[PDB]
């Protein structure tokens, strides 16, 4: 009984037309991925950093180690083209299956075949579709393990010499490390999983995830839910929709912070510096500028009494001063060479700052993730001139908006599923109003 | 009749003067914690070094504040996003100096409001209602997450979250505008349209309904005694209402399905407040309002100012003065 504006709710018990919708939609995603890459590459200019150029997809490919060399210079754009073209080509196969299944193909499967036919209330069939997809996901996580270990490696912003593509020989397997990340506080200085700062741990984690997904994939094929699970959940198409919407929303909020804070698997050579990074870079920029002029940065009292250039964190580490005292948990390959065991090291600072580090600090400070919606770089009061919004801001804002709306979708559909599953989603039966049979509250 | 089962039956009783529920099991203590720490702090907390510069700001009544100027002051910039519970401080004197109460209040409060929202779904399920009132509440709840959590996460410090005080609120909205030009951000503009719009339709619906009440009383009695709680027939005539408003504008710009009218009432402000919550949440990542500074120039290259540049002058004076002791370097990058 649905209106045109809820028209796709008519697909709920039409397994065949629903398959075509999912598969047509999957072609749309592969199409955007293919077209967008070709759009980006057509527009790419290799003398410019990627993050002066509105690129989000190319940085993802460069990070897998294709097309780049030491320090992030692009050496070869052909892997970018190939990735685009193959996604684009495959969208049409998916397109094809999707229109065929959505229009010509059997309206419902369970009559044509008991394997591909499904009923939402069949707890075993559903957990078995779950298991197949788990194994698929398991495979996917290992494909990246395999790229890192057997097919050329990954870009490592932490490599010595400015970063490089590097093959990962000893991924981390210790579960105290891999699973310790899941137990770290999300608060500052800890960062939960977002703080992962080496490729060994990333590749380790994916060996683990891929095994667990396969483990569990196999589990759900061979089992059925136990009574405690059967009594806890709603078993309906809408209720499974709502559950995945919860998980996508959760997942998008994590993504948002990942790209905002993590400069390891979102290397700043490609995506630009993080907010924290750029704030630190400025304190570095003016510490270098002033010490060259003769300033004793470690003894310079600032207006507040706190060090103008250098102060102490609340647990005592020597850190950059000014408003960037908030960002002292920052860790970056240009900055770490100055860190001694008490925090920043005044003898290294006095003696060992290199030109490449001066360059990097200048660059990142002037490419901080601040910009207007119409792509005017800098703080809100800056004039026109610099056409620039950091890829981090675009990637963080888009996925916050989406994560938010999917959480709304989760409440919408979960409440409705509960309500439909109990028979009152369409309103209150007048002849039988629950509240009219309850005693008054007073 | 098992111990656990009687308990579960009281928690979910629809006979409790106030519904408890499983979401209420978390909401009651977290909101009692926040409430008791807020009241005590507003009245007596000593001054807080909000900006990390050993420059404490007095927020409480006993320290020379009134109801307008008082606040619970955000925690110190020195802490940034670090978790500062009481037991991490060497003493309560330290914890008070560095702004610990604010962190305690906002975290308990966020949890408890998150559960307020679930509690709203839960009772609707126990009463046989449709479920979506809680989706309506998600817009304010989203707005509170935006200014207490998201915006700090993105700027790196709970010291740039919104103070819990009337003047503190104005501080935060003044500085927001210098740093983000939120007035020129379209999601704030929809928020204004969401909130101006809802005030308008509030008054429309309440004026049109009130205009078409059916005569049930005399001039010596409140018209409200025309309606009895739970009477089965409507108490106004919606066709007289449709017939008035449809002629005020034209027929089809007026409703006559009450279900579509009330859904429209619900959806306009909720959606507009979602957006403005999104604006605060995306300006957290410095994707700021439109920048038209020096966008108009003449044949020679002189700048021809617009109102946008006048706004910028204002923004500039906000920028150069906020936290006047707090910046050692020329760019306030966060």
């Amino acid at each position: 009984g649905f209106a045109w504006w809820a028209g796709n709710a008519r697909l709920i018990n039409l397994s065949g037309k629903l398959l075509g919708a999912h598969v047509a939609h999957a072609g749309l995603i592969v199409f955007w991925a293919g077209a967008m890459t070709l759009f980006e590459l057509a527009h790419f200019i290799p003398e410019k950093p990627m993050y002066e150029q509105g690129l989000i997809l190319i940085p993802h490919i460069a990070t897998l180690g294709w097309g780049v060399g030491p320090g992030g210079e692009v050496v070869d754009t052909f892997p970018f083209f190939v990735v685009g073209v193959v996604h684009l080509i495959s969208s049409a196969v998916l397109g094809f299956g999707g229109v065929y299944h959505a229009i010509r193909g059997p309206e419902t499967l369970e009559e044509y075949s008991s394997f591909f036919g499904y009923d939402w209330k069949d707890k075993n069939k559903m957990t078995t579709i779950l298991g197949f997809h788990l194994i698929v996901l398991g495979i996917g996580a290992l494909l990246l393990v395999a790229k890192a270990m057997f097919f050329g490696g990954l870009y490592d912003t932490w490599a010595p010499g400015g970063g490089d593509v590097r093959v990962i020989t000893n991924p981390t397997l210790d579960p105290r490390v891999i699973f310790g990340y899941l137990l770290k506080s999300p608060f500052g200085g800890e960062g939960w999983i977002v703080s992962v700062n080496n490729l060994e741990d990333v590749v380790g984690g994916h060996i683990w995830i891929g095994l667990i997904c396969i483990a569990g994939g196999i589990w759900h094929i061979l089992t059925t839910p136990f009574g405690w699970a059967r009594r806890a959940f709603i078993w309906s198409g809408e209720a499974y929709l709502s559950y995945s919407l919860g998980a996508l929303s959760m997942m998008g909020f994590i993504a948002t912070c990942f790209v905002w804070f993590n400069n390891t698997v979102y290397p700043s050579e490609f995506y630009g510096p993080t907010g924290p990074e750029a704030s630190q870079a400025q304190a570095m920029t003016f510490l270098i500028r002033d010490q060259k002029l003769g300033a004793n940065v470690g003894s310079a009292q600032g207006p507040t009494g706190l060090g103008k250039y250098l102060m102490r964190s609340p647990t005592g580490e020597i850190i950059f001063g000014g408003e960037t005292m908030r960002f002292w948990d920052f860790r970056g390959p240009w900055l770490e060479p100055l860190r001694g065991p008490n925090g920043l090291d005044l003898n290294k600072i006095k003696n060992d700052i290199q030109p490449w580090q001066e360059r990097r600090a200048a660059e990142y400070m002037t490419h901080a993730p601040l910009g207007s919606l119409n792509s005017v770089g800098g703080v809100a009061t800056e004039i026109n001139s610099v056409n620039f919004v950091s890829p981090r801001s675009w990637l963080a804002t888009s996925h916050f908006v989406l994560a938010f709306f999917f959480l709304v979708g989760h409440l919408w559909h979960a409440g409705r599923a509960r309500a439909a599953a109990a028979g009152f989603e369409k309103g209150i039966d007048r002849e039988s109003e629950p509240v009219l049979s309850m005693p008054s509250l007073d | 009749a098992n111990l656990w089962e009687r308990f579960c039956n009281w928690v979910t009783s629809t006979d409790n003067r106030l519904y408890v529920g499983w979401f209420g099991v978390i909401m009651i203590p977290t909101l009692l914690a926040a409430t008791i720490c807020f009241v005590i702090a507003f009245i007596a907390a000593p001054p807080v070094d909000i900006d990390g510069i050993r420059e404490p700001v007095s927020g409480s009544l006993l320290y020379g504040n009134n109801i307008i100027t008082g606040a619970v002051v955000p925690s110190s910039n020195a802490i940034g996003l670090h978790f500062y519970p009481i037991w991490e401080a060497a003493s309560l004197d330290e914890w008070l100096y560095n702004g610990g109460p604010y962190q305690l209040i906002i975290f308990h409060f966020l949890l408890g409001a998150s559960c307020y929202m679930g509690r709203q779904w839960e009772l609707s399920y126990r009463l046989g209602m449709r479920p979506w009132i809680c989706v309506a509440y998600s817009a304010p709840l989203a707005s509170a997450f935006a200014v207490f959590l998201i915006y700090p996460i993105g700027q790196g410090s709970f010291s740039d979250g919104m103070p819990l005080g009337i003047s503190g609120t104005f501080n935060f909205m003044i500085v927001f505008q210098a740093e983000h030009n939120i007035l020129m951000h379209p999601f704030h503009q929809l928020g204004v349209a969401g909130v101006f719009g809802g005030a308008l339709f509030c008054a429309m619906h309440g004026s049109l309904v009130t205009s078409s009440l059916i005569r049930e009383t005399t001039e010596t009695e409140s018209a409200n005694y025309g309606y009895k709680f739970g009477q089965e027939e409507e108490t106004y005539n919606i066709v007289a209402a449709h017939g008035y408003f449809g002629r005020l504008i034209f027929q089809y710009a007026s409703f006559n399905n009450s279900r579509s009218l009330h859904f429209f009432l619900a959806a306009w402000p909720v959606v507009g407040v979602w957006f403005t919550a999104l604006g605060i949440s995306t300006m957290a990542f410095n994707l700021n309002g439109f920048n038209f500074n020096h966008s108009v120039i003449d044949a020679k290259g002189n700048v021809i100012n617009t109102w946008a540049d006048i706004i910028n002058r204002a923004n500039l004076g906000m920028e150069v003065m906020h936290e006047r002791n707090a910046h050692n370097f020329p760019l306030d990058l966060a």
Partner: peptide, 30 residues
């Protein structure tokens, strides 16, 4: 004296909350 005044009014409002919930005119039907 001004602190006593602000806190007294606040406390009176909290007291009125209590009566207005627990000691309201109960809604009755038809």
């Amino acid at each position: 004296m001004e602190t006593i005044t602000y806190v007294f009014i606040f406390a009176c409002i909290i007291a009125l909350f209590f009566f207005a919930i627990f000691f309201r005119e109960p809604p009755r039907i038809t």
